[PDB]
From TrEMBL, chain B:
Chain's role: Protein 3A: Localizes the viral replication complex to the surface of membranous vesicles. It inhibits host cell endoplasmic reticulum-to-Golgi apparatus transport and causes the disassembly of the Golgi complex, possibly through GBF1 interaction. This would result in depletion of MHC, trail receptors and IFN receptors at the host cell surface. Cysteine protease that cleaves viral polyprotein and specific host proteins. It is responsible for the autocatalytic cleavage between the P1 and P2 regions, which is the first cleavage occurring in the polyprotein. Also cleaves the host translation initiation factor EIF4G1, in order to shut down the capped cellular mRNA translation. Inhibits the host nucleus-cytoplasm protein and RNA trafficking by cleaving host members of the nuclear pores. Counteracts stress granule formation probably by antagonizing its assembly or promoting its dissassembly.
Name of the protein described by the UniProt record: Genome polyprotein
Summary of subunit composition and partner proteins: Homohexamer; forms a hexameric ring structure with 6-fold symmetry characteristic of AAA+ ATPases. Interacts (via N-terminus) with host RTN3 (via reticulon domain); this interaction is important for viral replication. Interacts with capsid protein VP3; this interaction may be important for virion morphogenesis.
Portion of the full-length sequence here: 639 to 861 of 2193
Family: Belongs to the picornaviruses polyprotein family.
Species whose genome carries this gene: Human enterovirus 71
Location in the cell: Host cytoplasmic vesicle membrane; Host nucleus; Virion
Top-level taxon in the UniProt lineage: Viruses
TrEMBL record, chain D:
Family to which this protein belongs: Belongs to the picornaviruses polyprotein family.
Residues of the full protein shown: 518 to 561 of 2193
Superkingdom in the source lineage: Viruses
Name of this chain's protein: Genome polyprotein
Localization of this protein: Host cytoplasmic vesicle membrane; Host nucleus; Virion
Oligomer status and interactors: Homohexamer; forms a hexameric ring structure with 6-fold symmetry characteristic of AAA+ ATPases. Interacts (via N-terminus) with host RTN3 (via reticulon domain); this interaction is important for viral replication. Interacts with capsid protein VP3; this interaction may be important for virion morphogenesis. Homodimer. Interacts with host GBF1. Interacts (via GOLD domain) with host ACBD3 (via GOLD domain); this interaction allows the formation of a viral protein 3A/ACBD3 heterotetramer with a 2:2 stoichiometry, which will stimulate the recruitment of host PI4KB in order to synthesize PI4P at the viral RNA replication sites.
Function: Protein 3A: Localizes the viral replication complex to the surface of membranous vesicles. It inhibits host cell endoplasmic reticulum-to-Golgi apparatus transport and causes the disassembly of the Golgi complex, possibly through GBF1 interaction. This would result in depletion of MHC, trail receptors and IFN receptors at the host cell surface.
Length: 49, 223, 238, 44, 238
């Protein structure tokens, strides 16, 4: 869905760093905490938080 | 002046810490001797006082006041032996522990003034501690059970072995009251003061039917 | 608000926060201490000293309070746990950060305190003559922590009303939402057992109960974040 | 992986569900190499 | 908060606002254009370049999104409409200010973007072989603007998920309530038709739906305020 992925469809090889910014669009009165984790290649999805 | 609230002043005084009965006949101490492990909390108000802190250092001055149960002074020679932590206590009146030179002995007459000695800081650690959140070393492996919890072993201070000199039983009924005074007190880590009755000597266990400190009031509005 | 990053762990906290250093002393490496040459004990700085975030607690209208034991809280988690379990001797400082997430329509107060040598006392029924000693799970609850049975006496016969004599900080939902406590290594020895001795316990107890009108979120999360300060381990391995 | 650290907390009057929008891009060290035309369908 | 006044029109906005300039270029007069001497085209700055505030839109739980075409949005309003309709050639920049009025108990997100040469594509039923071209009211909706039928493809076969490649700004009700976009004149010619060519379209689309507990105001107003930057008109009259 990203312009990045669609521009990759026009090429064969690529490499570099990526940025993924998350935006919370709840109400101003809402609060809480999320844990966003990055697992490097090879490693399995972590089983719990 | 604020010298009355220094720790030294707070613990300064000498209090009764142990009584030793050495009767003519009876089941108490039939072998005319007694072993008394040094117990800081022999003096009632001392435990709660001392447990205001977590770690403490101090010297101890022991004074031995001996007489008969009537308070009578009689011509009897006594031996006060200090058995250091790690040394074996006498098990009989004929035990060789009584003549081991490395156990400091004091030979006093009941006629003489009270005997008096100073005990240094005996712990191998840097401070005694009245609270030890954990099971004793070594660690681990299992270990044997939970029974050992809350017991610090580095608080061991020594033992006083009290006997009448001689091979034959004394002609007099004796009582040896011993007094302890803390010197050079330092303390660390203040704690909330005990507000529930004590149950056991070596743990903070409390009755499951617990009480407020006080509460002589019906409502918050009326004094 | 800013981004706080140490090691591979990153938390979201506020610069506008008041920190309390326990007993006015910062955690430090024991260069003072004992045996050196040869040789000084392994010290982990970059990797092990990271932000370990415990599973959050849900605090309710009926909650009595929780406690965690140190270093027991971590001797089962990360590479701290690895080091603590496979070494002979241990010492460390700690940065404890306790944080709540609540709305302006919630209310309540937490006392966040640190009590060195926090010995527990359970009961047999009131009273003796003989005693039950508390089990491992009540004296060393791990990273999950344990919940207080009798908060008023701190499960140890001492009034919670005087707990403020220990390094503490209030979490008043009206005023703040976080508490930060810095604890140095406190012991009668320079080194001790990581698995058999808990140098201190962390306490988080409601003095003023949680309240809210019906319809608001019934459980308010308490998130504990902690990071070893000056770790030090001696021994080998298995 | 995105995990719930704490539960979602709201007062009365705030909706009990909210949405996260994820935006992504490459950094300045990103490069692509071997060009290759491959897409969908032209003018049916 | 301050008072912003140009000409006879005055709006209430906040100084604490982040402005985005389209393609990093400010609107400018076409001294660049060489068709000069004699003579340079009428350019109105004091009078015509004022704050035109369109009728506000009501954005609902079910809203799909709106778009306005430029300069079409104004070629039926003020003295701008008058210059644009009664001249031969036209060019101008624009200051677009989109603002919401909501409470802290509302939530939702708007993507405010500017798409040069925004060509619309309607359908015949899926699919051909032959085509219906969209009517005037769908390609040039005037000051009222038109509502999107299929937001996902922007009613033109292109993903809205990539609309952020155009000059844009998010309106997250949790964070901000206003968005300011500055658009320079973009064309393959220095001058064009004000009535037959729409140089760009403004898009305002809900990406995260409006929500609220019932009892709160069901419709949140979207107020569009716009002001021509460097107007320029050539030709005469009728």
């Amino acid at each position: 869905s990203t312009l990045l992925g669609q521009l990759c469809g026009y090429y064969t090889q690529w490499s570099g760093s990526l940025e993924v910014t998350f935006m919370f669009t709840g109400s101003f009165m809402a609060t809480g905490k999320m844990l966003i984790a990055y697992t490097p290649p090879g490693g399995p999805l972590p089983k719990d938080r | 002046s604020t010298a009355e609230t220094t720790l030294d002043s707070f613990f300064s005084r000498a209090g009764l810490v142990g009584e030793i009965d050495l009767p003519l006949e009876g089941t108490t101490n039939p072998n005319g001797y007694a072993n008394w492990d040094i117990d800081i909390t022999g003096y009632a108000q001392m435990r709660r006082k001392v447990e205001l802190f977590t770690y403490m250092r101090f010297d101890a001055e022991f004074t031995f006041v001996a007489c008969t149960p009537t308070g009578e002074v009689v011509p009897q020679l006594l031996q006060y032996m200090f058995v250091p932590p790690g040394a074996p206590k006498p098990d009989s009146r004929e035990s060789l522990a009584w003549q081991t030179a490395t156990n400091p002995s004091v030979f006093v007459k009941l006629s003489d003034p009270p005997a008096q000695v100073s005990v240094p800081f005996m712990s191998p650690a840097s401070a005694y501690q009245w609270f030890y959140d954990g099971y004793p070393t070594f660690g681990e492996h299992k270990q044997e059970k939970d029974l050992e919890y809350g017991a610090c072993p580095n608080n061991m201070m020594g033992t006083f072995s009290v006997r009448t000199v001689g091979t034959s039983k004394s002609k007099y009924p004796l009582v040896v009251r011993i007094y302890m005074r803390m010197k050079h007190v330092r303390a660390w880590i203040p704690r909330p003061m005990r507000n529930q009755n004590y149950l056991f000597k070596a743990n903070p266990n409390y009755a499951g039917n617990s009480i407020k400190p006080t509460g002589a009031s019906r409502t918050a509005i009326t004094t | 608000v800013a981004q706080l990053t140490i090691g591979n762990s990153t938390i979201t906290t506020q610069e506008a926060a008041n920190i309390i250093v326990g007993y006015g002393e910062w955690p430090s490496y024991c260069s003072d201490s004992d045996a050196t040459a040869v040789d000084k004990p392994t010290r982990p700085d970059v990797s092990v000293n990271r932000f370990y975030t415990l599973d959050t607690k849900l605090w309710e209208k009926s909650s009595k309070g929780w406690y965690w034991k140190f270093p027991d809280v971590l001797t089962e988690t990360g590479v701290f746990g690895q080091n603590a379990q496979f070494h002979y001797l241990y010492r460390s400082g700690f940065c404890i950060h306790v944080q709540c997430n609540a709305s302006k329509f919630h209310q309540g107060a937490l006392l966040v305190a640190v009590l060195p040598e926090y010995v527990i006392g359970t009961v047999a029924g009131g009273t003796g003559t003989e005693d039950s000693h508390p089990p491992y799970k009540q004296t060393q609850p791990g990273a999950d922590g344990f919940e207080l049975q009798h908060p008023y006496v701190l499960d140890a016969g001492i009034p919670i009303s005087q707990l403020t004599v220990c390094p503490h900080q209030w979490i008043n939902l009206r005023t703040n939402n976080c508490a930060t406590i810095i604890v140095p290594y406190i012991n009668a020895l320079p080194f001790d057992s990581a698995l058999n001795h808990c140098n201190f316990g962390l306490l988080v107890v409601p003095i003023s109960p949680l309240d809210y009108d019906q319809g608001a979120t019934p459980v308010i999360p308490i998130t504990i974040t902690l990071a070893p300060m000056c770790s030090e381990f001696a021994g080998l391995r298995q | 992986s995105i995990w719930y650290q704490t539960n979602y907390v709201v007062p009365i009057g705030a909706p009990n569900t909210a949405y996260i929008i994820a935006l992504a891009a490459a950094q300045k060290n990103f490069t692509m190499q071997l060009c290759k035309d491959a897409s969908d369908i032209l003018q049916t």
